[model samples]
Target: SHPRVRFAPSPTGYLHVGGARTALFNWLYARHTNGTFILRIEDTDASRNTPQALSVIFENLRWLGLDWDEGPLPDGRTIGPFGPYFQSQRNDIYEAYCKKLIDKDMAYIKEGAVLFRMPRKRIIVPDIICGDIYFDCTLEKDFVIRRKDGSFVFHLVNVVDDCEMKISHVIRGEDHLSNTPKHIAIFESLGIKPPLYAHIPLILNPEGSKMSKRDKGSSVQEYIDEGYLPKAFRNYLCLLGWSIKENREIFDIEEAIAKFDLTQIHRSNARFNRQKLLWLNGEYMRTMPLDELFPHALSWLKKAGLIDDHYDNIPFLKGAVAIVREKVKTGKELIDWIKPLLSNQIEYNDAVLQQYLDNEGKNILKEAFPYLEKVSPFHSKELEETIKSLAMKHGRKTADYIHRLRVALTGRTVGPSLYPMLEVLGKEKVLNRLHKVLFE
Candidate 1:
């Protein structure tokens, strides 16, 4: 059968990076084989699940660009052939499967709960990625298929959905590795062959432990909020335990799908490197068109209260970020870098201001205002030449005068090169900021 895979998030909370990788791998396999990619909301635990929780999953998955071919649509509608993808909607299917197990003497009702009877037999689970794994089922006891409330448990609903959905392969994190044998048993008892399984490794913290959404910073939304580009985040997550190539560290989704090999997945747990992710994010910001990063910058600016809904200045937004785009690690940082141009009153670093003041270049600083006022072009190159000529007339290094002006203009010595910013800030604001320096 052609590959048909699904990403069934339980919607307990935020989408974790570990969960995202499983979805990525499954989506990769499906796209590579020209098969179906499903988004099944495994919202079986009604007590722990909510409509909002499921929506969170949909929003984040869509943000990552992992569009499903057959699943519940983002709105209250079904898409493709898989109708009612939510496990909560398919209670009747779970009930029928439980009854099938009971008819074959594979399960029994225990205190109003359906329990799958464990046999004294060993099982070997064939994993495409991790090779064959042996299990000693004789030591285990009967497990619940349905709760006292008559709602099906996770294990049962999951297997039944995979089977009914005609999923050709089961690709998920290694944490579920032990559950493979149990699922395999369930499949055999139902007189159906199990799908191919590939248990990819877990993503652990540097402390050598599994991360949770409740942890200080483990959820996927945390990265999004921290200003990680969705495409860059997806590319980084793909290399968690699997690699498209040994030498290359970055590739797009299309290249990833072309080179994805389930057997190449490493069994060892991959550690979460937050620093590398930040660096990769900066690289993405650097390479992509400045206009592409404008919306993210604008969103951050709005959230930070730096701007209002009066965002009619698209060209200014583009120019503001274009100058400092390379200096920012994330869109969140772009606000900090562009604050000077965005605001009339820019805060100054005391030490930076004091250093410029100590230079004894006030003579040249005073002359710069009149010279700048007369510069015909009122632009960077003209402004730059005028200032350089003033530096020569005042008998001071051009670098010293430039640094002094930078402090008054931006309140810091480090930023995008001065002239272009002067051009971007325009003649009026530049004069206003320069007047503030002249008096203060």
Candidate 2:
């Protein structure tokens, strides 16, 4: 049978990375098995579950490309055989389940709340990620199913929804492992077979501390704001607590779906490696074709105020991005790398300027200007030859000219290769920038 998996996220203000990873694993598993991937909104906590919070969950999931086969759509409508998917809207179903439990003597009303009568025995929890574990139900007390205010608690609602939705596997974080026994008891009381469970390992900080909302890189929105490519971010998330064959780290989503398996998930927690993610993002940027990379580059450039609605210089923009994309790791970093090429109002690195553009260096630029101005068919190769010939003529190494020229033109000693950068800047802008540095 095709496993039906669901990612039921509470409408918290932000979607944490742990929650995102859980959703990813379920999505991958569902995709692999050709099963149904459901998105259930656990928005019962009315105080915390606002419209904005729900929007955040949808936005983050869509951003990660984790579309659901069944769940609430963004337009307040829902799809799936088992809905209303939002827990808050399913109070009638919970009330009916509460009545059934009471009729079966599995639950009784205490003052104003309904409590489930937990059986006094030990139960072994079957987990796919972590092996079967013993939980003593004898040590557990009768817990609340419905509160005095007629509102259902999490355990009862979660189990009821899972049963009604016919979810085949419950894949979630290990932090929820402790709550599984209570859910199982509820399922048993309802005369329904509990779904198979897979409690995946936790995600921790780089220093091995517990990751929290306050921790850096904890929220998915941070990655979006930081200009992480969704595909690259999704690829990085796949590595946390899961693996493919041969210890491969970089693969497309289709490969992930083809290779994803519950047995390969680790029991040990995975640490968030920001640097590794940055490196992976850079690799994606470097290898992405210009046509594919253009939209993202353009968006970031506009966001950084480097381009505008009237900015119609497509060829120039694409040329600049091509030369600089390999040197940058993020959209934010791309802004810094490509800013000098867009406009002449570049801020010079004072230390680099002092080090590379001293009195002798200024004299060298002054001497090289005439030849650079006269160089025919202004292009990267011609510019390189002209600079090298001038360097030899001045009895100086090419670095002597290259170093000062880079700093004067782009205000940084490091960036794309010098000749390509020169060609991208074009002959007129190049001469103007050099003349400004020398005589302005």
Candidate 3:
């Protein structure tokens, strides 16, 4: 039979990168094996789980493109046969199971709470990722199944849901490995075969500490707000605990699905390397289809007030982006690179001006001004040839002229290649900005 896996996350306001990776691994395994991937909301702790919080999980999952085979939709409805996917909505299911355990003398009511009579024996967790794990349940105490307030605890509902949902494999973070013995005891008492378990490694900070809510990049929303492409972010998540062959770093979802397996997940915790994610996002930015990348870039540009709804001249805009696309690491960087081109008033880097705009530099621009005015077609190719020819005639290195011209035109010593930027700015804006810097 095909495997049935799940990603059960508590709607705790933020989708932690650890939880996100858990979801990704489950989704990858399901797609790889032609199995079912379920999403169950463990929203039993209602005090912390809000409607907005629930929506965050949905939004993050959707943004990552991890569409589930079974789960709650954003609307009130759910998709799978074994739902109410939200644990808070499955009270009757828990009540029936509690009754069965009580009737079997596997549980008892004590101080108004239902407690499971943990069997005094050693339990072996058959984990695919971590291998067989032995737990001494003999030393453990009877644990709570339902609180005095009539709420079911996580172990009971989690096991009941996995059994009821027919979850064939439980692939989760290693932090849950210690809890597996109790969950296993619950399954044994209920007389249902426990699902195969895979305790994948936890995610740690780059500093080798446990990642918490306070750490940067701990939440998925940060990546979205920082303009990371979904595909690139998802691809990075895949590398956290698992990898593909060939030591390759870049692969699409389809390639991941084809190569993913439980055996490949590493035993040690993975570190969240922010620099690597930035580099990967840059790769995606450079290689993504311009049509696909434009809207994302446009959204960031709009957010920065570089462009607005009425902003036209798309041909000019796309051309400008194309030149700088290879140079930026994120959408925010894309906006920064293109900002001077869009706005008329640019603030020159004072230090660059002091270093590159000396008397000799001013003379270089003044000498090149007439040639720039007369250069036909005003395009990148012609502009490059014109500047190089002028630099040779003046018996100076090309960078002397190039650096000063860049600061004068864009007010930055570095940006997209100067000539294309000059072409995109058009001869009018170019000469006007240049004339202001030279003679204003």
Candidate 4:
């Protein structure tokens, strides 16, 4: 049979870079062989599992376009034979399998958390990436495959599901390397043919420490919140383990499947380079279709707690994002940058207010207010023309008129170019903000 694979993520929390990379590898493997790409959410840990967190995994996975071929139903809706895909939903399957293992004397169960006692022998983990990774059968005693509460630990559910789903290849993060032997033992005891296993390498912080979500820093949500493009995040993550070609870093999933080779993976720990991620993010951001990317930007902004219903229709917000998405670094950054643009009332800083305290700039703004109020078209060109005509009429730089005007309108000296900003803000609001910057 052709190989089938899964990108399994625990719904206990948010998706991380390591988890995402593992998913990517499995997805690529399946696609390469034209096989199944299972998206399994191990949400058995009912204690910490929130509806929102479980929803996060699904939402994030779809956002990355890592679609599933089989495995758990999305949001409790059933589809494949794996119906009710969550581990919690598969409790009966695991319990029955464990009893079979125990009946064969291949596994031992105790009164406490059930453990799968291992054979006192050596097993060579034939790692496709790291060669034969050997393990001495020491400390290989039956560990808790299921918690006292009947919620399955990862080792049991993962093995049971993989076997049942007929997963032919297991490709996952190297961090799970320590747990693979336990899984391998289970598969062996089940009298099932074990799948081909490849460890995709560990992702480390620049400090050489483990980059965990619990650590005090950016989580995957933070990346999404920061407006780091999904394509960029996915592309940068793929580089952490395997690459199709030397000196080439850009590729979508289809291209990756075409060139993905298990042998290309290295056993060494890979550094998670944020700068590289940012650079790739910038590259993808530049190539992103403004209209397509706009809705995502708005959604991200909403998720980041930046926008609300108070913010008007998404199309309008996207119009705003489009005018300046080029120069924006991330969604949060854009939100910060856009704060000034969307404000009905912009309060200038003391220093800026002082600079505009008494000058041709402030005077010109005041003089233009009546014309701005009367201007019917009320858009960027009109703002530019009025400002330009004012400057020409007075021999002042368009720079002079706009500098103080933006400060009055945005409370910042720097922002999206004045005209585009003006276009999005519209005539009435634009004039109103400038009015506040002056009178208020």
Query: How big is the RMSD of model 2?
Result: 1.4
Report how far residue 222 has shifted in candidate 4, in Å. Answer: 3.3
Arrange candidates by lDDT, descending: 2, 3, 1, 4
lDDT of 1 at 427: 83
RMSD of each: 2.0, 1.4, 1.4, 4.0
> 4-103 in candidate 4: lDDT tens per residue?
8888776766777677778777777777778888777666556887788877777777777777877654556755775556666677898898888778
Candidate 1 regions exceeding 4 Å error are: 305-309, 358-361
Candidate 2 lDDT score relative to the true structure: 0.89
Shift of residue 384 alpha carbon in model 4, Å: 6.1
Off by over 4 Å in 3: none
**Residue lDDT tens for model 2, 173-253:** 998999898998889888789999999988887788877888777899998888788899999999998878777799999
Q: Measured by C-alpha RMSD in angstroms, how accurate is candidate 3?
A: 1.4
Greater-TM-score candidate between 1 and 4 = 1
lDDT (CA) per prediction: 0.82, 0.89, 0.88, 0.75
Supply candidate 1's per-residue lDDT for 309: 65
On residues 1-440, what C-alpha lDDT tens digit does candidate 1 reach at each position?
27889998888768888888899899888888898899888775578787787777888888999988988875688786756798878988888999999999999998989998766589887888788999998888789989897878777887899889998899998878897777888888898888999998788888888887688667888888878898899988887887855647678889998888888887788888888888888889888877777777777788764547677876876777888887778877776778877876778767866677554645557868888888878788898898789878877677877887778788877787788888888788888888877777
lDDT per residue, candidate 3, 100-162, as tens digits?
Answer: 999999999999999999888988888899988988878899999999999999889889999
Q: What pairs collide in candidate 4?
A: 72-85, 116-142, 226-331, 227-331
lDDT-better candidate, 1 vs 3: 3
